[PDB]
Amino acid sequence: RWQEDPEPEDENLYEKNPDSHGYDKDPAVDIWNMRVVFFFGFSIVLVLGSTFVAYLPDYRMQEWARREAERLVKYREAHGLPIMESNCFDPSKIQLP
Amino acid sequence: XXXXXXXXXXXXXXXXXXXXXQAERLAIRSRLKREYQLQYYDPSRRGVIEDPALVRWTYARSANIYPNFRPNTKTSLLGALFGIGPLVFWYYVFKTDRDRKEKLIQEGKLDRTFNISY
C-alpha cells in the first residue's frame, strides 16, 4: 500500500498557457529576464570582453621581448664574437669541487 | 562467429513439436504488442513510454554486479592476469628504452644539435 505516495503529474510549458516562454509562469517576468539580462551578459562579456582576453594590455611581456631582443642582436654582433648565449649568467664561479 | 555453412534456412523440419513451438512464440509476441497498441492510439497521452524490457536492459550493465561474482573459481582469476597483467608487460618495454637513452647522453652522443624543444 502506498496511500499517499502515488502522486505524479506530467508538466510541460511548450506553448499551452505560456504563448512562447522559457521561465515557468508569468509572461511579464519571462521577457524581462530570459531575453534582456540573459542577453546583456551575452553582449558585454562576449563582444566587449573580446577586446581584452590577451589583445591590448601586452600580456606577460610577449610584445616587449621582441623589441628587447632585436636591439641586443645588432649590438652583440658588432662588438662581440659569440651570439647571445655561450656562457651566460655565470662568470668566475667559486670552483666546482 | 560463423560455421562452415551460414545459417539462414538450413536444418528445418515441420514435424509436430515445431508446429506448437511457433504457436508459443506468436502468443507472447501478440500479448506484448496489444498493450503497446492501446497506449499508442490515444491523443490524451503525450509522453515517452517505459516498457519493462529496456529498463531491465540498462539495469543489467549499470547494476547486478555484487549479487554476481560469488563463484569466482578460476575464470575470474584469469581475467585479473589479463587485467593488471598488461601493466607489468609494458613495465619492461619502457624500462629498456630508458637504459638505451640515458647511456647515450653521457657517452657517444645521439641527440641532435638542432634539438632544443623539450
Partner: protein
C-alpha cells in the same frame, strides 16, 4: 577585489521577492564575471603577488575565468528543475552554488598549500548536499558516500605530508618564497612522503585505478544537468599537482614512472567501455576520464612543453564536457530517461540543437585550432621526447576519441522515435543560449590562445 562582491550574492537571493530570485542571481553574476577578464590578466615575467596571503595572484591559472564563466551558466539549466518545489528550497540550492564559487575562487587564487588544503576539501561539503538530494534515479547514496570516501581517503594524507615539509624546511606559504626547497635524496622514508602528496590529486584527477569515484557521481544526476558541471569543476579543481611536482619534489620522477603507465592504460581501456554503454550521461563520464588522464601524463614528465598543453587542457575540457552534459540535460527533461537508444532523433525533431550537438562532438575530435587540438598536441609531442614508444599507444587513443563522440552522434542522427511523442518545443530560447555560451568562448580562444595556455608562455 573578487571576494566580498561574491559573498554579497548570499543576501541577494534571500532579500529579493518571491516572483524574481532567478533574475537577480543571473544578472549580477554576469557583471562580476566581466571584471575577472579585466584585472587578473595583467602579469610580468614572473607574476607578482596580489596582496596579503588571504587570496593571492595567478601565475599559471587562467582557470579561474572558467569558474567565472560557469558562475552564471550553472544557474541557466537549473531553471526547469527545482521550479516545482518550495521557494526556500530554491534559495538554498542557489546559495550552495554561490558557496561553491566562493571556495572555488579561493582555491585557484591563493598561492598556498596549507590554506589551499582547507579549501580543496572544503569544496566537497557543498557538492555532497547537491548530489545526495534531487536525484532522479535511485542509488544516490552509492554516489554520495563514494564522493567523500574516495577523496578524503586520499586527501587526509596531505596533513601528514604538507606539515612535515614546513617543520623541516622553513614554511610553505607563498610558494614564491619557496626557493628554500632542496632536492630529495631518494630514500625509503621519502617514498611515502611523495605518495601522500600525489594520492590527493590522483583521485580527483582520475586514473585507471581509483577512478570509480567519477562515473558514479555523473550517472546519478545531482540536479538536472547543470550541477554535473560543478563536478567537472572539481576535476580541474585538483590543480595542486601543477604546484607540488614543480616545487616540492622536482628531483623526484623515478616514482612517477609507474603512475604514468597507470594513467596510460586509463586511455585504451576507458575508451573501450565507452562504446557499448547504454547511459548517455555515462558516455560523457568515461570520456572525462581520458581527457584528464592526458593532463596526468603531462605533469609527471615535467618538461616545459607539457605544461603548455596541460594548462590548456584544463580549460579545454571544462567548457566542452560541460557543453556535452547540457546536451544530455536537454534530452533528460524531455524524455525523462538517461537511455541513449530510446531518445533517438535530431534535425527531424530537434533542428537547431543538432548543430550544437555537432560542434560539441567535433571538439572531442581534433578540430581546426580551437583549444582542444592546442591542448592535446603538446602532450603528444612531449611524450615522444619522454619515450618514443608512446604514440603507438597514443595513436590508438586518437582512433577511439572519434568513437567517443561519433557514437553519440549516430545514435541521435536517426529519423525514428516511433515510441516517443513528447519533446514538442525543441529549445525554449535559453536551451540553445546555454549551448552558445559554451562554444563561443572556445571560438574566441582561436584568435588568442596565449591567454589560455600560459605557464611562462
Amino acid at each position: 577585489k573578487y571576494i566580498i562582491p561574491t559573498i554579497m550574492l548570499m543576501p541577494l537571493t534571500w532579500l529579493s521577492k518571491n516572483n524574481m530570485i532567478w533574475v537577480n542571481s543571473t544578472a549580477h553574476s554576469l557583471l562580476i564575471s566581466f571584471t575577472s577578464l579585466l584585472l587578473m590578466n595583467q602579469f610580468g615575467d614572473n607574476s607578482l603577488n596580489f596582496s596579503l596571503l588571504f587570496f593571492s595572484d595567478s601565475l599559471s591559472t587562467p582557470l579561474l575565468i572558467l569558474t567565472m564563466w560557469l558562475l552564471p551558466l550553472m544557474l541557466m539549466a537549473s531553471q526547469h528543475h527545482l521550479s516545482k518545489e518550495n521557494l526556500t528550497r530554491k534559495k538554498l540550492f542557489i546559495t550552495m552554488l554561490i558557496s561553491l564559487q566562493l571556495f572555488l575562487i579561493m582555491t585557484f587564487t591563493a598561492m598556498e598549500l596549507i590554506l589551499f588544503y582547507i579549501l580543496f576539501e572544503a569544496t566537497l561539503v557543498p557538492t555532497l548536499i547537491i548530489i545526495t538530494r534531487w536525484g532522479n534515479q535511485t542509488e544516490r547514496l552509492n554516489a554520495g558516500l563514494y564522493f567523500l570516501f574516495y577523496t578524503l581517503a586520499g586527501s587526509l594524507p596531505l596533513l601528514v605530508a604538507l606539515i612535515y615539509i614546513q617543520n623541516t624546511v622553513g614554511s610553505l606559504n607563498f610558494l614564491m618564497l619557496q626557493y628554500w626547497v632542496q632536492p630529495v635524496h631518494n630514500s625509503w622514508s621519502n617514498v611515502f612522503m611523495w605518495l601522500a602528496c600525489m594520492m590527493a590529486f590522483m583521485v580527483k584527477m582520475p586514473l585507471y585505478g581509483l577512478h570509480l569515484w567519477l562515473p558514479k557521481a555523473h550517472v546519478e544526476a545531482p540536479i538536472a544537468g547543470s550541477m554535473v558541471l560543478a563536478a567537472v569543476l572539481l576535476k580541474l579543481g585538483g590543480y595542486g599537482m601543477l604546484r607540488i611536482t614543480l616545487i616540492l619534489n622536482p628531483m623526484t620522477d623515478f616514482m612517477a614512472y609507474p603512475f604514468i603507465m597507470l594513467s596510460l592504460w586509463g586511455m585504451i581501456m576507458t575508451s573501450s567501455i565507452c562504446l557499448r554503454q547504454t547511459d548517455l550521461k555515462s558516455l560523457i563520464a568515461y570520456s572525462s576520464v581520458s581527457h584528464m588522464a592526458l593532463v596526468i601524463v603531462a605533469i609527471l614528465i615535467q618538461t616545459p612543453w607539457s605544461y603548455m598543453g596541460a594548462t590548456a587542457l584544463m580549460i579545454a575540457h571544462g567548457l566542452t564536457s560541460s557543453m556535452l552534459f547540457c546536451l544530455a540535460n536537454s534530452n533528460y527533461e524531455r524524455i525523462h530517461s538517461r537511455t541513449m537508444i530510446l531518445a533517438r532523433g535530431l534535425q527531424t525533431l530537434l533542428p537547431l540543437m543538432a548543430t550544437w550537438w555537432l560542434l560539441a562532438s567535433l571538439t572531442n575530435l581534433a578540430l581546426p585550432p580551437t583549444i582542444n587540438l592546442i591542448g592535446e598536441l603538446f602532450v603528444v609531442m612531449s611524450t615522444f621526447s619522454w619515450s618514443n614508444i608512446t604514440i603507438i599507444l597514443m595513436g590508438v587513443n586518437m582512433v577511439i576519441t572519434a568513437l567517443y563522440s561519433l557514437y553519440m552522434l549516430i545514435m541521435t542522427q536517426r529519423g525514428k522515435y516511433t515510441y516517443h511523442i513528447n519533446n514538442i518545443s525543441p529549445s525554449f530560447t535559453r536551451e540553445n543560449a546555454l549551448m552558445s555560451l559554451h562554444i563561443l568562448p572556445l571560438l574566441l580562444l582561436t584568435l588568442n590562445p596565449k591567454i589560455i595556455l600560459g605557464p611562462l608562455y
